[PDB]
Structure formats: C-alpha cells, structure tokens
DNA sequence: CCC
DNA sequence: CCCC
RNA sequence: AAAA
C-alpha cells in the first residue's frame, strides 16, 4: 500500500484505515521544502498519518524535491523506494503510477464516498473522531463542551433548565421571529451601547438617563409596557440576583451598586439572551437525535469547539458534527442582517476547510427570512464538482424544527 | 493535412486551462476539451460551463472538440467514453496538458493518449508559474508571458455585469469637485508623516462618538440635536480641545460649506438648519473621513508603481470592483490587481478591532477564490498593530503547498509606505 | 468569538 | 449600496 | 480527494 501525501490528509487516513489490514509495508510520498520554487513540505501530514494509522516500522518516507517537475521526480524516485493515487499533484499521480509500474490502483471519490479500483462505499464504514480529525490537520489543544458541562449551566445553576425550557417552548410555538425583534428593539438598545457598559455602574446609569430623554418613545418604556408575555416568562426564569427586570419593570441601578455587583447580575444574563442561548437551543435539538444514530458526544459531536495550530491563535466553532468521516461545522447567529450573516458565512466556510479538509460541510443558521437565506447561499456558493451543497444556510422559519432539518441535511 | 491536437482536462478551476491554451493555441490545429457530465446519483456536477467559457475566450471556434465523461472517478467508464469519442483522425503531434480534472481523469487519459501515440505531456506549476514538458524537459515560465484582464478572468469563472471605477472617475472626486485634490493631499501628508495611528484613535474618539450612532442621524436636524444634547466627559469637549493639529488641517481642507468644524470648534446646527442643510454639510464629509478616504489613499499610493510595470488601468487594476453570478447577489471588492495571470484582491479597512478585521479577512479570502480561482492571493489592509496583523495572518492561513502566503495582512505601521509594501508583496 |  |  |  503506497500513498501520495498532499495537503489534504483526510483521504489518505480513510484509505489507510481501510487498506492497512490487507497490507504489510507502507510507503508515503511527501514533498520537500524549497522556498525558492514556492514549494512547501507535506512531511507534517505524513507524520500524522503514520501516527494515527499506527505504522511505526512499516512506514517509508520518500521525499520529492520537486513535485511539479517529472524529471526531478523520477530522479528522486530512482534513488529511494497497491497505489492509491488520490493525493498529491497531477504530476505526482502520473509519474508514480507509471514509474512503479515500469499493480493495483485505487482512488477515493470525494463525491460518492467510494474507493474505486482500476465499488466499496466507505461513508458508513470508516469512522473518525474530532481529536484525530483536527490532529491530522495539525491542530492541537482541542477542547470542547458536553451537554452536561455547558458553561451557562454553571452560571445560572438551579435555573438553567427552566430558562432553557421556556425559550425552547417559545421557539417551538413559532415565536422566534418575535423574540429576535424584541432582542433588536428594545433589548440591544438598553444593554448594548459602549464597551464595558454592563461593567461600570456609572456607564450604565448614564446610558439609562440618556435613554430617558425620549420619554414614552424611550426604549425602557418599550421594555416595561410593550414586552410580550413569553419574554417576561423567560426573563423571570432567571435567578433573582441575575434578573434584568425589577419586578415587572427595567432595573435601574442606584449609584450605591458596585461595578462587580452590576456585572454579576447583568453581564451573564445579557450575553446569553443576546445569542448564546441559540447555541444551546440548536445543540439540544440535535443531541435528541444523533444518539439514535450511534454518534458519541465528545467523539462525533459537541459544542464550543476550540483549537489552535502551534504557536497560532485559536478558533471558535459553535457546533461540530462528524458523519462518517465528513466534518459538519455549524455556525449560529440570531442576526437578521445581511452584512453580518454573510461575514459569518465566509467564516464557517473557511474554518471547516482548515480543520476538516476541503470536503467538509459548513452550515449557517440565521434569523433571516427565507428569501435572504436563499440569496446568501447563492452569493457564497463555490463550485467543488459535486451536486450536494457544502454550504447551507437556514433561517428563522427553520428554528422550530431545526433538529430534523439538520438531520435531513447531514444524513 | 498534418493536423496537430492539444488536449486539456476541464476541472473546476478554468484559469490553468486558459493559460495553457493562450500559450499553445499557436502551435496546434485541433483542441479537445475533456469535461465532466452532471449525474446527481453519483453527486457529480458538470464542468461544461467552464469548457464553454474556455472555447469562447480562447477563440477556438470549430477547431474545438468537446469530449464528455460520464464518471470522473470510474476508470472503466472513462476508458469506454474516451474510445467512442476521441477523434480518431490521424494526427502527427498529440499534446495532453493534464493539469486539471480529477486524479482518475489524469491517470487514464494520459495512458490512453500514451498507447495510441509524436506525444508530449505538460503540467502547469501553480507554485512557480512554469509549464513543464514531460519529454522536452523544458520548464517555460508563463508568469510574464501570458496576460489576462479582469473581464475575461471573471467571465471564465462565470461572473458577469462587471463594473469598476477609474482613477479619474472616482466617486468622491465627483462629490468634492475642486476641493478633492486639496482634501486628498492633506490626508496623504499626515499618513506619510506616520500620523495614521493618531488619526484612527481620533476617528474612534471623539469623531465616531459625534457623527455615528442612530440611523439618519446626520440627515435629520431633530435627531442630531437630541444626540448632541445627550453628549465634561462628552466627546464634544475632546473635539474642541484635544483635537490634534494635523487633523484641524485636513478638516480645514474641506470647503467651508462642507466642514464639520465651525472655526476651531464643532459646528452645531441652529434651529433654522433644515434637515437637507445638515446632510449637505456633514454627510459626505463624515463618510469620507470614516473610511472611504483610505480606499483612495491606498489606490493612489499604488497606481504609479502599477503603471511603471506596464499594467493598464481598467484591465489589470481598478477600484471598487463589482460583479455577480447570473441572477445572484453582487459582491464588492475595494481594489483588484492582476499580476500576470494571478488575481490580487485587496480589502481595506481603517478599523483596529480584531473581530471585524477577522471577518473582513474571511471575506476577501472567499471572494478572490470565487472570481479568480484557487491560486488567487488576498490582501487585507487594516489599522491594527503589527502583532495583531501577524496574528490574523496565522489565524486564517490555509495550507495549499506554497511557501509564499496567499492571505496577507497589513497594519497601521504599513500605511506610510503601503505602495512599496504592496509592490514587494505582489511582484517577486 | 453574543451582537 | 457592504465607511465603521 | 476536479493547477497538491
Ligand atoms: Mn478518540
Ligand atoms: Mn455564533
Ligand atoms: Mn473596505
């Protein structure tokens, strides 16, 4: 079994995991680093493949000084040496399929998830976890949260379930559109102003005063009088020390309220209601189904995934999901705005590519109507050669049944 | 008679086939474009739209033969489709450039045209811009030979309704006639004097606290008055007392009818100021100072160095590019630049916030890949410091097999010499 | 890294 | 139209 | 894994 090590390590891991039991020795062709010819090395991917495929003594590393020149290829192939030709450049594939012949040949079809011999579907045969997937793509310090280790369960203890159930009831009663509009106005008009607004008692008090310069038109009036009943019930499901409501009105802090007391009461509550809630909602709707499909939490799905390349910044991904050996990254936002949603679309498309390879699927769930979501999908669509979409946008109309929506899209 | 044929494999990246065709059309008489056919059962999309664009922008006419393949991943079906559809006419030289298509297509097409036949196989190197012949052992550099314009580049990637702006037709030269040159020169002086950081921080506070907030703030006298009422911590005093001198100069470079200052102080409308009077004075000035100016500044610091390299404006560079796929939303790119056959898209922002600049980074990465192919380069110019600039480059870096970066970020410390920095990054 |  |  |  011979493999060509390009910049996408996942196809070689899938083929290697399958065609290791039937083989003895393993050769991996990798490129060298020549900054002059703008050629980087895939040796790091070749090492990850050996480690994650357990090939300590059977593995042979063959370096090619130039993967774009047949002359320098064969010269390097001469001095040192079932071919799966799925990876590497076109030259590497030609001048190795022929050099070695001068003999079975395989190829992993990224479109139908089948290894083809010069057949066998591997979509429900070869499996991978989140740690192995990000490791072969060179990411480390992987951490995520479980259903029972969710961060906000520790912040609103003894009240989270009531809070989450109340929000879940509203969304399943098709109130998600009403919730978003109230979040835009007046919620974000009171609790989203300047930086450190909810951390300095004076900053918040000044903001509240200036808001009372419009009287009945002031957003605090919309909060007090024109707030729907299901939103009050959500607000009142929070602990009294973490409530944004003073009984049935907007809480105005006296100057005696310390900065840590204001922050300890408002900050966690505002950030959750301004969007983090939607992360938990979707994840809870998904976990109620994926377990029936034998997926294991922490191995094949989870929430708040974070990792980094070596000495490099961390990324944040709301939800990850592995179906067979395809990564499905899900980005979540309550925004109904085209600018932000588009940018969020660019982000999730690039992230799943970085951590799961070029055949990963990105899903963006927004608070936009059906027309805006179709426009965004077309705007960000990129041609990969497949009929199935690798970027999918959902909208406010999908929130109530988002669990089955994602199940149909992923599986 | 002695008919010589060139064979190209139509993958999802049309640019390499256009470059190979533009360089080899003169040497061959027939051209066979092997493309894929759509079959949803095997999740196989078709690349025929690219092969059709290749015939159009290469002017192949009837000397073009379209050879469809049913399954780009099945060795047997490819071999059968090739035998029943490759031209059996006796040729003298058969040249296959196997740069595109799937790995399976490349394997068997190369062998099929190896047994049937003079023969020569070629491959275009995306890393060092070199066409490698498999038997001539020549490696011709096409980086300075084959050229492409913005219209043909976006067209072969299936985009249309392309429009952009020129140096002389720039939008704000139409809005600030006579005064634009004075406004632009004063700003360029301060930036080339390393006053970029000061300007940015002054734009964040107190400029954006005064002229940015509610919608239609600067077009409604009542909304602007209430805003000023709400504002010794107010940004108005920071404007009237703390505003630096080079900013007073660029503010005074505006016409007195379009100036935000009322004479070393903030102009506050009286109660006889119409809504239209307010917007006519400050709207264009605020929007130009909040960021539009930076687009013109960067474009002006590069136009000279681009013309010196014999690039033609409108075809190889331009400002405010816009295009769309058929019946699809439009994109907007601040600056575009084509070096040989490589697109360089430049997104510009004066923001120093890490989150907004990160999102702007994802944007320019995706757009240049959509309109220019997978070997395009994206540049993001920000008002961030070098440490955050370098952090963003590593955060968004994607490995494709090159040593040179395909996503570059520049920061506030590059503004004074941004022309040379772009020149060295693009041309090397 | 919510918006 | 997408300046921040 | 359809200019690695
Ligand atoms: Mn494991
Ligand atoms: Mn999110
Ligand atoms: Mn811009």
What are the Cα distances from residue A134, in Å, to A4, A141, A142, A200, A333?
20, 10, 8, 40, 24
In angstroms, how far is D4 C1' from B360 CA?
12
Angle between helices B418-426 and B293-308 in degrees, nearest 10: 50
| Closest-approach nucleotide to residue A339, Cα vs C1' | D2
Please give the torsion angle defined by the CA atoms of residues B212, B218, B221 and B226, in that order, rounded to the nearest 10 degrees. 0
Residue A386's SS3 state is strand
Q: Can you tell me the distance from the alpha carbon of A232 to that of B106, in angstroms, rounded to the nearest whole number?
A: 64
Token pair of A73, please? 């290829």
Instruction: For residues B428 and B423, give the distance between their C-alpha atoms in angstroms, rounded to a whole number.
Output: 8
- Which domains, and CATH codes, for chain A? 2-126 (3.40.50.10770), 157-277 (no CATH), 297-410 (3.40.1350.10)
A182 Cβ contacts chain C strand, under 7 Å: no
In B63-140, alpha helices (H) = 75-83, 103-115
A266 contacts A198 by C-beta, under 8 angstroms: yes
State which residue has its Cα closest to the C1' atom of C3: A274
Alpha-carbon torsion A294, A296, A302, A308, what sign? negative
| CB-CB neighbours of B285 under 10 Å | 21
Tell me the two tokens of residue B240: 């009237």
Distance CA B108, CA A93 (A): 11
The residue of chain B with its CA nearest to that of A121 is: B42
**Whole-number Å distance between alpha carbons of B176 and B168:** 13
**Cα–Cα distance for residue pair B44/B35, rounded to 1 Å:** 12
Q: Which of residues 156-195 of B touch strand E (CB under 7 A)?
A: none
What are the two backbone dihedrals, phi and then psi, of residue A401, each rounded to the nearest 5 degrees? -115, 35
Note the strand D nucleotides within 7 A of protein beta carbons. 1-4
Nearest residue: Cα versus C1' of C1: A316
Q: Where are the beta strands (DSSP E) in A188-289?
A: 245-246, 249-250
Q: Distance, in angstroms, between A386 CA and closest chain B CA?
A: 5
CB-based contact B43:A112 (threshold 8 Å):
yes
How far, in Å, is the centroid of ligand 2 from the Cα of A318?
Answer: 6
d(Cα A391, Cα A363) in Å, to the nearest integer? 6
The approach used to solve this structure was X-ray
Paired tokens of A357:
């390879």
Quick one: which of A334, A314, A255, A306 has its CA closest to A130? A306
| Distance (Å) of CA B84 to CA A8, A280, B45, B77 | 34, 57, 22, 11
- CA to C1' distance (Å), from B41 to E4: 28
Q: Is-cis flag, bond preceding B206, omega within 30?
A: yes
Nearest to A69 among B139, B331, B394 (CB): B139
Q: Is the peptide bond before A186 cis (omega within 30 degrees of 0)?
A: yes
Q: Which two tokens stand for residue B57?
A: 């922008």
Strands (E), A18-165: 26-31, 59-64, 83-84, 105-109, 114-117, 120-121, 140-145
Give A298 Cα–ligand 1 centroid separation in angstroms: 9
Decide if B230 contacts B295 (C-beta within 8 A).
no
CA of A85 to C1' of C2 (A): 45
Instruction: Pick A38's closest partner by Cβ from B11, B38, B128.
Output: B128
Q: How many C-beta atoms lie closer than 10 Å to residue B314's C-beta? A: 13
Which of B44, B107, B404 has the CB atom closest to A38's CB atom? B404
Q: Which parts of B89-147 fold into alpha helices (H)?
A: 103-115
What's the farthest any 2 CA atoms get from each other in chain B?
Answer: 91
Rounded to whole angstroms, what are the CA distances from B13 to B18, B46, B186?
Answer: 10, 12, 44
Listed in sequence order, the DSSP H helices in A129-215 are 130-136, 151-155, 160-172, 176-182, 188-191, 201-211
Closest CA to B142 of B7, B276, B24: B24
Query: CA-nearest residue of chain A to B205?
Result: A194
Element at A70 (helix H, strand E): helix A70-79
**Ranges of H-type helices in B131-211:** 150-156, 171-175, 180-191, 196-202, 208-211
Q: How far apart, in whole angstroms, are the C-alpha atoms of residue B94 and residue B31?
A: 10
* Whole-angstrom distance, CA of residue A128 vs CA of residue A12: 13
Tokens of A37: 């010819």
What are the chain A neighbours of B44 within 8 Å (beta carbons)? Answer: 111-112, 385-387
Cβ contact, residue pair A116, B72, below 8 Å? no
Kindly report the bases of strand C lying within 7 A of a protein C-beta atom: 1-3
Judge: B396–A350 Cβ closer than 8 Å, yes or no.
yes
End-to-end CA distance of chain B: 44
Structural resolution in Å = 2.3
CA pair distance B156, B373, nearest whole angstrom? 10
């Amino acid at each position: 079994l011979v493999l060509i090590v390009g910049t996408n390590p996942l196809p070689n891991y899938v083929v290697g995991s399958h065609l290791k039991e039937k083989y003895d020795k393993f050769v991996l062709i990798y490129s060298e680093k020549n900054d002059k010819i703008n050629q980087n090395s895939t040796y790091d991917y070749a090492k990850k493949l050996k480690e994650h495929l357990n090939l300590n003594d059977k593995c042979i590393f063959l370096p090619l000084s130039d993967v774009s020149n047949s002359e320098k290829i064969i010269n390097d192939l001469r001095e040192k040496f079932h071919l799966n030709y799925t990876g590497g450049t076109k030259t590497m594939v030609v001048h190795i399929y022929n050099f070695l012949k001068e003999f079975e040949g395989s190829y992993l079809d990224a479109r139908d998830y089948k290894l083809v011999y010069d057949a066998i579907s591997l979509k429900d045969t070869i499996k991978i976890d989140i740690n192995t997937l990000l490791s072969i793509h060179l990411y480390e310090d992987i951490h995520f949260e479980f259903y029972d280790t969710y961060s906000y369960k520790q912040k609103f203890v003894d009240s989270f379930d009531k809070i989450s159930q109340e929000i879940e009831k509203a969304i399943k009663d098709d109130k998600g559109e009403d919730f978003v509009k109230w979040l835009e106005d007046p919620f974000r008009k009171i609790f989203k102003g300047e930086n450190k607004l909810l951390e300095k008692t004076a900053k918040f008090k000044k903001h509240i005063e200036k808001l009372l310069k419009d009287n009945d038109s002031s957003p605090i009036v919309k909060f007090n009088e024109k707030t729907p009943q299901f939103i009050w019930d959500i607000l009142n499901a929070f602990p009294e020390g973490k409530k944004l409501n003073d009984g049935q009105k907007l809480w105005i802090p006296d100057d005696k309220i310390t900065n840590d007391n204001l922050s300890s009461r408002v900050k966690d509550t505002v950030e959750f209601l301004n969007g983090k809630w939607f992360e938990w909602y979707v994840y809870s709707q998904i976990k109620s189904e994926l377990l029936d499909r034998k997926l294991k939490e922490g191995e094949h799905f989870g929430i708040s995934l974070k990792a980094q390349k070596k000495d490099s910044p961390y990324f944040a991904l709301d939800i990850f999901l592995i179906n067979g050996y395809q990564l499905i990254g899900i980005s979540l936002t309550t925004s109904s705005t085209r600018e932000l949603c588009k940018l969020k679309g660019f982000e999730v498309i690039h992230r799943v590519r970085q951590i799961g390879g070029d055949e990963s699927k990105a899903i963006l769930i927004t608070g936009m109507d059906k027309s805006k979501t179709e426009d965004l999908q077309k705007d960000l669509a990129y041609e990969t050669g497949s009929t199935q979409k690798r970027f999918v946008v959902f909208g406010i109309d999908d929130w109530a049944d988002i669990g089955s929506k994602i199940c149909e899209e992923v599986f």
